[PDB]
């Protein structure tokens, strides 16, 4: 009943998380989308493929596989869009004003208007990316944050998980200390990073609403997988 995750050291945890990272995928090379149909066609196709990788990433997060299948399902159903969004914002960091959905699909807020209700979400994403950039978010910190989302977002809509969450907190502090931050800088930065998780949640909620409206507008069919992830949010 004991999880290997708790026996790992800070560096083993970080290396595990870094090693679990999914690949950066490409968009279909066709369509420069200026229609609602083509825009959402490309993004939904990409999301579909990203989800499969996310599911296999989650299985590689220490402590996750220790949960029942039902618990794993619940956590992923709750966090999937938050997880896609934090990845997007991270990939877009070194591209101010741009959202790097894929290396061959780098979009801006102008792009967003060609889809009713999308420019609002684009703006929130861009704002978050900029915040990450100014904070000089490190990749080691990013993978910790992404794992925190997976384990935290659905945890109150249910002990092991909280212990693993604590471990990840220890891991974040470990990284900041390793980087030479003073104690006060350590707790302040930890707070700043975790507060951004509130905004990521907000974006996910708003995005889920938008995705639902697009489903009812039926301008593009969604996959069975994407539909089931959306339906989980009732």
């Amino acid at each position: 009943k004991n999880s290997l995750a708790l026996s790992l050291t800070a560096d083993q945890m970080v290396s595990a998380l870094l090693d679990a990272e999914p690949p950066i995928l490409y968009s279909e090379y066709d369509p420069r989308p200026f229609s609602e149909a083509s825009m959402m066609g490309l993004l939904t196709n990409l999301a579909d493929r990203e989800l499969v990788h996310m599911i296999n990433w989650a299985k590689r997060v220490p402590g996750f596989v220790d949960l029942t299948l039902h618990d794993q399902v619940h956590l992923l159903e709750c966090a999937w869009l938050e997880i896609l969004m934090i990845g997007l914002v991270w990939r877009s960091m070194e591209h101010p004003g741009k959202l790097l959905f894929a290396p061959n699909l780098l979009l801006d807020r102008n792009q967003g208007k060609c889809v009713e209700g999308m420019v609002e979400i684009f703006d929130m994403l861009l704002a978050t990316s900029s915040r990450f950039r100014m904070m000089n978010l490190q990749g080691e910190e990013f993978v910790c944050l992404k794992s925190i989302i997976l384990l935290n977002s659905g945890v109150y809509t249910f002990d092991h998980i909280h212990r693993v969450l604590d471990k990840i907190t220890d891991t974040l502090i470990h990284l900041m200390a390793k980087a030479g931050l003073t104690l006060q800088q350590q707790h302040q930065r930890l707070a700043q990073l975790l507060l951004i998780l509130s905004h990521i949640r907000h974006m996910s909620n708003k995005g889920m609403e938008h995705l639902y409206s697009m489903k009812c507008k039926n301008v593009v069919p969604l996959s069975d997988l994407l539909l089931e992830m959306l339906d989980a949010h009732r």
Binding site: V52, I55, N56, K59, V73, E77, D224, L225
Partner: peptide
């Protein structure tokens, strides 16, 4: 019956 239930086991 969820696709997620299957993908998590695959």
């Amino acid at each position: 019956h969820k696709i997620l239930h299957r993908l998590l086991q695959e």
